[PDB]
Design a protein around this ligand. Structure first.
Ligand SMILES: CCCCCCCCCCCCCCCCCC(=O)OC[C@H](COP(=O)(O)OCCN)OC(=O)CCCCCCCCCCCCCCCCC
Ligand SMILES: CCCCCCCCCCCCCCCCCC(=O)OC[C@H](COP(=O)(O)OCCN)OC(=O)CCCCCCCCCCCCCCCCC
Ligand SMILES: CCCCCCCCCCCCCCCCCC(=O)OC[C@H](COP(=O)(O)OCCN)OC(=O)CCCCCCCCCCCCCCCCC
Ligand SMILES: CCCCCCCCCCCCCCCCCC(=O)OC[C@H](COP(=O)(O)OCCN)OC(=O)CCCCCCCCCCCCCCCCC
Ligand SMILES: CCCCCCCCCCCCCCCCCC(=O)OC[C@H](COP(=O)(O)OCCN)OC(=O)CCCCCCCCCCCCCCCCC
Ligand SMILES: CCCCCCCCCCCCCCCCCC(=O)OC[C@H](COP(=O)(O)OCCN)OC(=O)CCCCCCCCCCCCCCCCC
Ligand SMILES: CCCCCCCCCCCCCCCCCCCC
Lengths: 504, 601
């Protein structure tokens, strides 16, 4: 019963942020902070009361909480929400990143700030709705609903130093990629619903009933391919990755918009919940292609990240390589690799959030993103280079941070399943260390390569420093004590894995 | 006991305090925090050793918590204590405290004093995690930690880009070693279901009764990780370039912590290596070849730090040779004694560099025995211990035990490789000493001076029970081996005195010859492994990075937009605004529709 409020509190909060701009120009940030804190508190209350650590795997469907209400009864479409351990971890993560995105938009008080916060809250509510919806039309509706506030945030509130047409080009490329992939998913959804309707005789878009739909291998393969194309655009999977560094580079330069809309990975969750259970035979046949696409993604993202002269594009290609690791993990049949994928998704969220916030602070201090124009910044700044060193170390895959835990559990399970791909992926870890050290050397070490770097810069505020240190503490605790997260996701991950391997 | 976690926590507390101080504290406060954290770690290690010998040298276990538990994948966060762990922990904490006191004196007036001590405290904590780890994944955490702290400390003077390049090279080569170690971890978990050392040794013979191939692969990957961290073949190219940092960093890396990690890894996992005798003999071969190559390359270096770096490579090759001939106690004993005299040598070279200026070449400085007598005495004792002078140096007894273990197991080629290496070790060591030094009693230096003599040889590590006993050689054979090693070292010292002490006509005649120039150029560049690795890995990596710097996959996904724009511009030519053309197009469409309907019928 709290799931509809988990979706609705961001929407009502965005509406109140828009409306309460008349009461003051610095008012709607407090409303956004209060509503994102309420969403995070409700997610934590669902975590505490859920008892996920004591839950044993009982098979799909198995929901800790559920909600159903008819929406379009002609097609059997209902607002049907459900939460288990994996969805709960994703919802807590997006609540935390939403609070960080509100705090990162602090002290940016201009006209139509309330509409900026409305767009931010609607993106966050759409992400939560993606994580909660367990019927196909509502999932697709939330999947495509995030793209309009995201488009207008990139195009209208985007990077102010750009040409103005580059922001529109990047936003249009993002929107076309994601909406066309969504339409392919909608075609797959409709064809699955019609196959079920011909097999049984009742219209349904419910995920629980669309399981075990009898269909041939070719039709199941085509439906899996439509779902995979939609998830592969947003994962990102090469060559469908090209929207991501352009969307990151032309995003609003606070960095809050990255955390709100681009940073989270709903596509890995989508693969886990709707690709392996709905089409297990097709996913089993597709697994070599997906794992080789993941290997190509790891190495291509590392090579692209090394070659960038811009920090934001470097972090974007870092994300591409990490999601290649996750994509390898998903198409194995290992509970260990799936738990590593969950830990890696959360750790990538925390580390990429820290990197993007630090990059935004550095850009607002030096007014450039070109690493050829910056250097020797360790001697010129107070807190930023050391925290950037920590977060580059974390994205490198350093033990003591959760990225190592996720990546190495992925590699352990994958080696139990596919050894050659695991060998190549660990060399991908070597390439990750190469690009992290390249970024640290080009940005913060050496001599200053321009006049803007040869000056003492103001230190970070208490708010930015405290939220970065919160991210640091969360990453360190996830690296040293990841057991609560594993116990939370264990039952859902076991259900997905036992559905995937017993039907093949 | 029950204070191993304290030996980890105190350097961690020092690292956190000195990192978050970010230079605001005075140098006295930061110095006492860093040196006192390492010193209290050493004092707790002393209490732990006293308690360990108070019992019957029994293995102690301190399980802190459970790191991760997914199904049967149950990696625990546990610490273990036996004779090997106590020996490594005592060496690391004591030599690290001596180096920390010397660096407290030495780094005065430098920017990033507290940052330096934070990084060294994190280095000590990572090495203690490495040596005390109950399983292989906690050991991997310590392994990566010492690699990261080596990266942070080698490139300490970050304003010079060459130091940063050296640190990046060291980190990338050791991460290739870490990848090999991770392969070993994956194989061992997939085969045995555990990464605990004792459990792996217990469960290995039952699982590999039919096939031994996967255990051979696991031990080969353990060897790959060990040669990555200890700078052996084929991953030795980083150690010579890693001299860019301060001399306490070099002393810490080359004596206390980093290069001794591979030897500890081989000695700790000896139960798995004894089941694959070919891989253990390969460890011995790698050690012998590495010590020979390092002895060749150290003879032609023109810098004290590079001579000491290739000396470190040669001594780690000696330890690997001792491990490969199943002389484990000799390997750990030589590790301890080499830590002593190499820390002494590096601190004395740092004193030389501080007394002089601009980092002059060894042919520039000369006749320095009268300018600095006590530094000359420290260098003399350290080089005598390195060259294994008989009956006065601990390195003599260490190399004697290594060669006795090589003889007792029927390894003659490895024995003559060790003899040639000892001769060349004396040759290059006293070449540097007679070139530099011919032509205020600090406490760590005095302690290392005492420990570099036979007093350090009096210390016997408590390895009886952890590592198997080396087979005992005959009394006549060990006596003639002692005589042979002694006369080899003595004629090495005397030939070095005849060549480089004096007018140096003969060595200049050899060096100015064309084969002499070719051999000097070959050995100066570390046998061309830097060049080979550059041309084989670094150049094609940069070539692919240049080739991909404008995203090709993004462009081949952008080409549908190009086709759509071209097709739209082509279709817009029909909208010419001419009414007769509109009528004509309607009639054309009528013809096409009627013809299609007639064809389809
Ligand atoms: C403006 C210009 C640019 C824009 C336009 C460009 C073109 C857009 C359109 C591209 C897609 C074209 C159509 C692809 C689907 C073809 C379907 C097909 O051939 O189906 C035949 C058969 C149907 O199944 P059937 O055999 O009847 O089953 C009963 C017993 N098996 O099928 C089967 O039996 C299974 C066949 C599986 C393999 C065919 C599907 C290939 C999909 C290619 C894309 C995905 C590639 C892999 C993933 C890459 C990364 C995402
Ligand atoms: C664990 C045992 C060992 C086993 C192996 C472990 C290996 C992995 C360990 C990873 C730790 C992080 C390593 C990379 C980041 C290093 C940061 C750094 O260099 O800090 C130094 C810097 C002070 O340098 P300075 O130049 O004097 O000042 C800046 C200019 N004013 O400092 C600063 O400016 C302030 C501090 C910046 C961030 C420091 C590191 C943060 C993470 C560790 C502490 C987190 C807080 C403790 C609580 C955790 C949760 C309980
Ligand atoms: C690699 C270094 C060695 C490890 C020490 C430092 C690691 C990093 C410190 C910060 C992060 C710590 C995260 C873990 C904290 C302890 C977790 C915990 O409460 O474990 C539960 C355990 C109770 O025992 P049990 O019921 O068996 O639990 C099994 C677990 N499922 O609880 C216990 O038994 C508690 C045992 C005592 C733990 C004391 C830890 C003090 C750490 C101080 C560090 C200060 C610096 C921190 C930052 C360092 C740089 C990253
Ligand atoms: C042949 C048999 C034996 C094989 C042994 C194992 C491999 C050993 C490899 C050793 C060589 C590693 C060299 C690393 C150097 C890094 C430091 C360096 O030179 O950095 C330069 C550059 C810095 O980047 P940037 O910031 O742009 O620089 C500004 C100005 N240049 O940074 C760079 O240019 C980055 C260079 C990256 C190099 C990547 C190396 C990948 C290694 C993969 C090993 C695979 C092993 C197995 C092979 C197959 C076996 C069947
Ligand atoms: C001299 C001192 C020591 C030096 C270091 C040690 C020597 C290193 C020599 C090798 C170099 C590193 C490569 C290590 C690969 C290890 C792979 C391995 O152990 O695979 C185990 C796996 C077991 O499969 P199995 O159980 O036999 O399956 C049949 C069913 N029973 O086996 C298999 O499945 C068989 C095939 C495994 C895959 C082999 C090739 C993998 C690809 C390697 C690429 C390396 C370069 C990467 C470059 C990245 C891009 C630049
Ligand atoms: C059972 C065996 C018992 C032991 C037998 C002997 C073992 C090997 C001993 C080798 C050393 C012998 C001592 C005398 C020569 C070395 C000392 C010397 O003369 O060095 C001169 C020069 C370096 O001195 P430097 O300080 O640079 O110059 C003076 C300052 N202007 O030096 C140079 O520039 C180079 C000197 C080269 C000396 C000859 C080396 C012979 C071995 C060559 C191996 C080549 C690689 C392997 C084979 C490849 C295929 C052919
Ligand atoms: C602030 C408190 C400092 C206490 C220091 C205690 C140790 C004395 C000084 C260092 C001595 C190092 C000696 C190392 C010997 C290693 C022997 C190993 C035997 C297994």
């Amino acid at each position: 019963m709290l799931l509809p409020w988990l979706i609705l509190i961001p929407f009502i909060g965005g509406f109140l942020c828009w409306q309460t701009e008349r009461f003051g120009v610095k008012v709607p940030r407090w409303i956004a902070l209060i509503t994102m804190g309420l969403t995070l508190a409700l997610s934590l209350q669902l975590w505490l009361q859920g008892g996920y650590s004591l839950t044993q795997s009982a098979g799909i469907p198995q929901w800790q909480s559920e909600f159903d209400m008819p929406w379009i009864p002609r097609f059997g479409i209902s607002i049907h929400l459900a939460i288990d351990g994996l969805s709960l971890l994703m919802v807590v993560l997006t609540g935390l990143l939403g609070v960080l995105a509100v705090l990162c938009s602090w002290k940016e008080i201009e006209k139509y700030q309330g509409f900026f916060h409305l767009n931010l809250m609607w993106i966050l509510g759409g992400v939560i709705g993606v994580f909660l919806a367990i019927d196909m039309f509502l999932f697709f509706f939330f999947w495509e609903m995030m793209l309009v506030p995201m488009y207008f945030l990139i195009a209208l509130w985007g990077h102010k130093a750009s040409d103005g047409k580059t922001r529109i080009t990047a936003a249009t490329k993002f929107f076309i990629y994601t909406q066309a992939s969504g339409l392919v998913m909608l075609i797959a959804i409709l064809a699955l619903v019609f196959v079920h309707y011909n097999a049984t005789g009742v219209w349904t878009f419910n995920y629980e009933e669309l399981l075990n739909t009898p269909m041939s291998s070719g039709v199941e393969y085509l439906l899996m391919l439509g779902f995979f194309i939609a998830f592969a655009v947003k994962m990102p999977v090469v060559p469908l990755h090209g929207w991501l560094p352009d969307a990151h580079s032309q995003a609003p330069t606070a960095g809050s918009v990255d955390l709100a809309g681009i940073l989270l990975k709903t596509a890995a969750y989508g693969l886990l919940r709707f690709s392996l259970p709905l089409f297990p035979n097709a996913s089993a046949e597709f697994a070599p292609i997906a794992m080789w696409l993941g290997v190509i993604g790891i190495f291509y993202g590392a090579w692209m990240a090394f070659a960038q002269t811009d920090i934001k594009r470097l972090i974007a290609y870092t994300s591409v390589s990490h999601m290649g690791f996750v994509l390898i993990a998903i198409y194995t049949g290992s509970q260990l690799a799936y738990q590593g994928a969950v830990i890696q998704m959360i750790a990538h969220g925390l580390s990429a959030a820290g990197l993007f916030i630090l990059c935004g602070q550095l850009y607002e201090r030096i007014h450039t993103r070109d690493m050829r124009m910056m250097g020797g910044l360790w001697s010129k700044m107070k807190w930023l280079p050391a925290l950037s060193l920590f977060f580059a170390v974390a994205t490198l895959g350093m033990p003591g941070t959760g990225n190592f835990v996720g990546e190495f559990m992925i590699l352990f399970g994958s080696f139990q399943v596919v050894p050659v791909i695991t060998v190549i992926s660990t060399f991908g870890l070597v390439f990750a260390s190469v690009y992290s050290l390249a970024m640290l050397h080009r940005a913060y070490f050496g001599k200053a390569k321009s006049q803007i770097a040869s000056q003492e810069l103001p230190g970070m505020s208490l708010r930015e420093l405290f939220m970065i240190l919160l991210l640091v503490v969360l990453l360190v605790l996830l690296g040293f004590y990841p057991q609560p997260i594993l116990d939370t996701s264990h039952s859902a991950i076991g259900n997905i894995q036992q559905w995937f391997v017993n039907s093949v | 006991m029950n204070m191993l976690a304290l030996t980890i926590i105190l350097p961690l507390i020092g690292f956190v305090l000195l990192a978050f101080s970010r230079g605001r504290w005075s140098e006295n406060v930061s110095a006492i925090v860093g040196v006192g954290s390492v010193g209290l770690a050493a004092l707790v290690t002393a209490f732990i050793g006293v308690d360990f010998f108070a019992n019957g040298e029994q293995t102690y276990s301190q399980p802190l918590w459970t790191w991760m538990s997914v199904g049967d994948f149950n990696i625990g966060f546990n610490l273990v204590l036996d004779g090997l762990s106590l020996t490594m922990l005592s060496v690391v904490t004591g030599v690290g405290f001596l180096i920390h006191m010397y660096a407290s004196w030495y780094m005065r007036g430098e920017e990033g004093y507290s940052r330096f001590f934070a990084y060294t405290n994190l280095f000590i904590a990572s090495m203690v995690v490495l040596v005390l780890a109950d399983n292989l994944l906690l050991m991997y955490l310590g392994w990566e930690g010492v690699g990261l702290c080596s990266y942070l400390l080698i490139g300490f003077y970050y304003t010079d880009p060459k130091n940063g390049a050296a640190a990046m090279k060291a980190f990338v080569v050791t991460r290739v070693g870490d990848v090999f170690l991770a392969f070993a971890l994956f194989i061992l978990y997939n085969e045995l279901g555990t990464l605990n050392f004792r459990e792996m040794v217990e469960l290995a013979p039952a699982h590999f009764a039919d096939g031994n191939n996967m255990l051979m692969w696991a031990t080969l990957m353990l060897l790959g990780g060990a040669v990555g961290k200890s700078a052996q073949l084929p991953l030795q190219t980083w150690l010579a370039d890693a001299m860019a940092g301060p001399t306490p960093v070099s002393a810490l890396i080359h004596a206390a912590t980093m290069v001794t990690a591979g030897v500890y890894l081989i000695a700790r996992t000896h139960g798995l290596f004894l089941m694959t005798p070919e891989v253990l003999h390969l460890v011995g071969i790698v050690g012998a070849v590495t010590l020979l190559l390092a002895g060749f390359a150290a003879l032609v270096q023109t810098d004290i730090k590079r001579v000491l770096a290739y000396s470190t490579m040669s001594q780690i090759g000696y330890m690997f040779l001792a491990l490969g001939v199943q002389a484990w106690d000799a390997a750990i004993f030589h590790l301890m004694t080499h830590a002593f005299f190499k820390a002494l040598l590096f601190l004395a070279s740092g004193s030389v560099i501080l007394a002089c200026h601009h980092e002059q070449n060894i042919f520039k400085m000369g006749g320095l025995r009268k300018s600095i007598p006590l530094v000359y005495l420290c260098f003399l004792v350290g080089g005598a211990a390195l060259s294994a002078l008989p009956l006065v140096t601990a390195g003599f007894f260490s190399k004697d035990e290594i060669l006795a273990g090589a003889m007792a197991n029927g390894h003659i080629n490895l024995m003559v490789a060790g003899l040639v290496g000892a001769f060349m070790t004396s040759l290059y060591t006293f070449r540097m000493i007679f070139i530099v030094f011919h032509g205020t009693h600090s406490l760590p230096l005095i302690v290392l001076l005492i420990l570099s003599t036979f007093v350090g040889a009096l210390i016997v590590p408590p390895l009886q029970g952890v590592l198997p006993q080396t087979t005992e050689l005959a009394h006549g054979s060990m006596l003639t081996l002692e005589i042979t090693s002694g006369v080899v070292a003595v004629v090495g010292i005397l030939l070095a005195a005849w060549l480089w002490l004096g007018k140096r006509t003969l060595v200049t005649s050899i060096a100015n010859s064309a084969p002499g120039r070719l051999l000097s150029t070959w050995w100066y560049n570390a046998w061309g492994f830097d060049w080979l690795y550059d041309k084989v890995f670094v150049k094609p990596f940069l070539g692919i990075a240049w080739l991909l710097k404008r995203d090709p996959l993004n462009s081949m996904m952008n080409i549908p937009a190009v086709l759509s724009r071209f097709a739209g511009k082509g279709l817009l030519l029909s909208e010419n605004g001419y009414l007769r053309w509109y009528v004509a197009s309607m009639s054309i469409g009528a013809v096409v529709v009627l013809a299609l309907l007639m064809v389809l019928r």
